[PDB]
């Protein structure tokens, strides 16, 4: 049962895991790089919000290619958890 969206999604994830494979250790209080199942984020300094271009696995990525998804890094040095503790982010720009 081919799922073309899933296959492209697995591709983006594979790509992100590696690219964060090379990047060298952080020199300050950060939020560890990660693939939060949506986008790949680098090591982000505490108390700062990170940005990324909308993921290309999205079917409408040609209409939101110029938009951004955001992910907040707390002063703790910890990424932001949604109510249930899952990976949290602002992908409003990227939505259909």
């Amino acid at each position, epitope marked *: 049962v081919m799922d073309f969206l899933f296959e492209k999604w697995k591709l983006y994830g594979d790509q992100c895991h590696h690219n964060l494979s090379l990047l060298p250790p952080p020199t300050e209080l950060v939020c560890n790089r990660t693939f939060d199942k949506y986008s790949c984020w680098p090591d982000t300094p505490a108390n700062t919000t990170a940005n990324i271009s909308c993921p290309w696995y999205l079917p409408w990525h040609h209409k939101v290619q110029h938009r951004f998804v955001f992910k907040r890094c707390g002063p703790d040095g910890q990424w932001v958890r949604g*109510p249930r*503790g899952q990976p949290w982010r602002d992908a409003s720009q990227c939505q259909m």
Partner: antibody
Amino acid sequence: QVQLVESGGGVVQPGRSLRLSCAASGFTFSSYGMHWVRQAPGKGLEWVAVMYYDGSNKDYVDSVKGRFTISRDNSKNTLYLQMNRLRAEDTAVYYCAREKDHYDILTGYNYYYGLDVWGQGTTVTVSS
Amino acid sequence: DIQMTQSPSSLSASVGDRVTITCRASQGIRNDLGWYQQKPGKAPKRLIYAASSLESGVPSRFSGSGSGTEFTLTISSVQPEDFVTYYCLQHNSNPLTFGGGTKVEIKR
């Protein structure tokens, strides 16, 4: 054939620590989030802890934060609960529950469907 | 911390009557609410999930409704085995929070 069984309950004195276990069968253990729920002798239901797969997502009810630890051994489909520095408020029956989640790729949302399957439970009595 | 206010604590009913149990969430939880039945000496057993859905193998007399902040559990005609305790559970945010519970006792 999907079942949950909690064991390890008994009598333990305040200050000392106890470990609970929860065995699962009939379903794929790795694919679900597991909860602990307890109920004091004559009181209602209270949520205590929760792990998922990762286990990067563990949460606890306030009264047990820094006191209880939840963990899981997927090889033998078993959930654990470390109970430390026990006290009166811990006296209760402890259940383990199953919960399914779902990640929507297009949206990026994570959906949770609540606790659908419980175990019979096991009693913990803290007293000297 | 979402408070789950359940009413009433205990109610009065005769078998065949219509029973109504309400659950008010302090914070909006959409349809992430579920209802539970607990018989004395046994572990809880879900009846309603997603607020409005009926668990497989549960009498058609049990029905839940509502969304957001207000929820209701209904038994169109109470049955002799239905006279037991019921709990509502919110799985929207951590921590997971239950209602105080409702004990249904047969009236005489």
